[PDB]
Design an enzyme around this catalytic site. Structure first.
Site: not given
Ligand SMILES: Cc1cc2nc3c(=O)[nH]c(=O)nc-3n(C[C@H](O)[C@H](O)[C@H](O)COP(=O)(O)OP(=O)(O)OC[C@H]3O[C@@H](n4cnc5c(N)ncnc54)[C@H](O)[C@@H]3O)c2cc1C
Ligand SMILES: Cc1cc2nc3c(=O)[nH]c(=O)nc-3n(C[C@H](O)[C@H](O)[C@H](O)COP(=O)(O)OP(=O)(O)OC[C@H]3O[C@@H](n4cnc5c(N)ncnc54)[C@H](O)[C@@H]3O)c2cc1C
Ligand SMILES: Cc1cc2nc3c(=O)[nH]c(=O)nc-3n(C[C@H](O)[C@H](O)[C@H](O)COP(=O)(O)OP(=O)(O)OC[C@H]3O[C@@H](n4cnc5c(N)ncnc54)[C@H](O)[C@@H]3O)c2cc1C
Lengths: 163, 388
Positions: B128, B134, B159, B342, B368
């Protein structure tokens, strides 16, 4: 008339009569007072030179200053010229460096990777001196030559000592 | 022969347990530190070499075990479950090795595969470029034959193991005529990293698999002895192409390892976290999510198994490896974000395992061969069955 839309006619060549012009009365609602005239900071500028990895050292960048005093110009570089030790970081043009778009951008020994084109494809005018002919940089440059930079660049600083 | 089987060879059950014990006793405990720091996990790589979970494609007459693609997939799934950054660093070796395996002569294989047998050296696949990934056929790194050598001029990008590698497999443009086709334009080299002219770039900073080193490499007048060219001048593109049959499934196994980790995490947690009086798993929507996640993983697993079985049978498996890398990568991302989800707020938090799995997984739809690229290959393979 835009200056570089036309050619400078010969400074010598034809000979021309010269008559006294007609007169005016001093108006004196305005008066001139003063002046102040002027190697810029990189981003604000209108003329940027930049060297890539093709220069090979930081002591080799003297050739790019040489010229960026003739073009009262700014001096940037690629990330690959920075990384190799040539220059400090505040000059890197490109995606991780200072985004620029002045009048005149010179890419010297710059392959022209998409990441460097992102920092300057908006320069009004773009110059490309690079010995490899299939070097990505050519597409984006209005102007360029497939040539050694150590012969072409010190030759340009000698076509602008006089002009 | 006999009918179908989805049963591991005893010997493969043994490989499985070793990789697991490693992944589980040694990687898991330390992956979040190495992820937090980007520190290249040298102990673990040496320990995986020690244990023979590394360089496994190398044929016995170069000092390796000459294991198959199925065997290599088992092992990666197991390492990847522990950590994808680590497993990517292990895995890189196989990618670098693969063109030398499939296309190298005896002096080439013995010399360059053989040294991997006696120390935990790394090697890298150097293809690359800033301007082409690609579109392999768009690479411009120059190779001109000057003497009984080649002189390499070019810059290489992303690389893996690029600044840790004893040698590189390098793909370069041999034919200056730009009209020259891909089947003639490119030549593949074995290049030793310590050659004058070679400049390893800085450690590149990505969202995921942060402990893996991935690096730019610049070649400035690089001297490469005629004997390190792979099949000859102009064979480069076929040789690089051919590495993928044997390697796509294994990266697919990696995506599955991370997928399975995500599932196990999110399941464990949904058996202790309660909301509204019940455990998470008693809320139907959560249960359905775990169910669909389990489908997704089982199906991905069979998919890469199938790819790997095809090539071990002496068949070219392009079509099946492409389905694997497409499906495995798409579902690893799906499972990762669900796992976060979750775990609610905790899942978004850095002291819990899952956000990393989400940052880790996205690369599976890029490298890849992108998700889109894989579909183009699958399409091309599928449609050809119908052209007559
Ligand atoms: C960056 C960040 C900033 C935040 N800031 C604030 C803030 O300023 N003030 C504040 O009050 N809170 C804040 N929070 C908390 C946030 O509001 C809660 O995390 C959110 O309400 C989800 O609650 P939980 O994390 O306890 O997950 P849980 O309540 O444990 O839920 C766990 C998983 O199960 C799912 N789940 C839970 N119950 C059910 C059910 N009844 N049926 C189906 N699925 C269910 C949920 O969707 C989730 O995927 C913040 C959180 C983050 C991550
Ligand atoms: C963490 C990491 C490790 C890597 N390690 C290696 C390694 O060690 N050896 C190595 O050789 N390379 C390595 N690479 C390079 C990597 O394989 C390439 O980034 C990838 O193969 C294609 O990347 P690109 O950035 O050139 O995509 P781009 O060619 O810029 O494509 C960008 C977007 O356009 C889409 N696209 C491009 N052409 C088409 C088309 N003809 N039709 C439809 N969609 C298209 C692609 O799907 C993609 O979403 C690494 C890359 C990363 C991010
Ligand atoms: C995330 C990321 C961000 C990046 N951001 C930037 C960015 O901000 N800016 C940037 O510049 N790069 C950036 N890069 C790097 C970029 O991809 C390339 O490394 C860079 O543009 C190439 O630098 P270069 O042209 O100076 O060196 P090279 O690409 O190696 O160019 C050398 C050129 O010099 C020519 N040459 C050599 N000798 C002579 C001679 N004496 N006469 C004439 N020509 C000669 C060669 O033919 C060649 O084309 C970034 C990379 C990544 C991964």
């Amino acid at each position: 008339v835009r200056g570089t839309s036309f050619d400078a006619a010969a400074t010598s060549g034809g000979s021309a009569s010269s008559e006294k012009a007609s007169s005016t009365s001093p108006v004196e609602i305005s008066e001139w007072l003063d002046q102040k005239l002027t190697r810029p900071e990189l981003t604000g500028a209108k003329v940027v030179v930049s060297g890539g990895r093709g220069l090979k050292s930081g002591e080799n960048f003297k050739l790019l200053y040489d010229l960026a005093d003739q073009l009262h110009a700014a001096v940037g570089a690629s990330r690959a010229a920075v990384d190799a030790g040539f220059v400090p970081n505040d000059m890197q043009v490109g995606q991780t460096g200072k985004i620029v778009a002045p009048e005149l951008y010179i890419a010297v020994g710059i392959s022209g990777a998409i990441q460097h084109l992102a920092g300057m494809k908006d320069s009004k005018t773009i110059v490309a001196i690079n010995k490899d002919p299939e070097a990505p940089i050519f597409q984006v440059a209005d102007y360029g030559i497939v040539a050694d930079l150590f012969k072409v660049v010190p030759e340009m600083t000698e076509i602008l000592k006089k002009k | 022969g006999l009918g179908f089987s989805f049963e591991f060879t005893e010997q493969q059950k043994e490989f499985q347990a070793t990789a697991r014990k490693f992944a589980r006793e040694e990687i898991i405990p330390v992956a979040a530190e190495y992820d937090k720091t980007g520190e290249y996990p040298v102990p673990l790589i040496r320990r995986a070499w020690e244990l023979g979970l590394m360089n496994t494609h190398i044929p016995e007459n170069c000092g390796g075990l000459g294991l198959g693609t199925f065997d290599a997939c088992l092992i990666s799934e197991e390492l990847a479950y522990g950590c994808t950054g680590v497993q990517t660093a292990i895995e890189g070796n196989s990618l670098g090795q693969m063109p030398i395996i499939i296309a190298g002569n005896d002096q080439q294989k013995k010399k360059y595969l053989g040294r991997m047998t006696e120390e935990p050296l790394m090697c890298a696949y150097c293809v690359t470029e800033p301007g082409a990934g690609s579109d392999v056929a768009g690479i411009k790194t120059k190779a001109e034959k000057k003497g009984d050598e080649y002189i390499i001029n070019g810059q290489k990008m992303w690389i893996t193991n690029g600044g840790k590698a004893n040698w590189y497999f390098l793909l370069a443009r041999s034919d200056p005529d730009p009209k020259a086709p891909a089947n003639k334009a490119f030549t593949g080299f074995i290049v030793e990293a310590d050659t004058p002219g070679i400049q390893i770039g800085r450690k590149e900073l990505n969202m995921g698999q942060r402990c893996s080193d991935t690096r730019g490499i610049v070649f400035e007048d690089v001297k490469v002895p005629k004997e390190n060219v792979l099949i000859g001048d102009g064979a480069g593109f076929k040789v690089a192409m051919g590495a993928f049959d044997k390697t796509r499934p294994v990266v697919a196994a990696g995506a599955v390892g991370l997928a399975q980790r995500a599932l196990d995490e999110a399941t464990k947690y949904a058996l202790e976290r309660k909301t509204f009086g019940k455990l998470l798993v008693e809320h139907q929507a959560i249960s359905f999510m775990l169910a669909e996640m389990a489908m997704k993983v089982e199906l991905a697993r069979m998919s890469y198994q199938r790819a790997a079985w095809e090539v071990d049978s002496g068949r070219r498996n392009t079509y099946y490896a492409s389905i694997a890398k497409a499906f495995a990568g798409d579902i690893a991302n799906q499972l990762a974000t669900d796992a976060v989800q979750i775990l609610g707020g905790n899942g978004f938090n850095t002291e819990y395992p899952v956000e990393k799995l989400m940052r880790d997984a996205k690369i599976y739809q890029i490298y890849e061969g992108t998700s889109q690229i894989q579909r183009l290959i699958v399409a091309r393979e599928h449609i050809d069955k119908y052209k007559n």
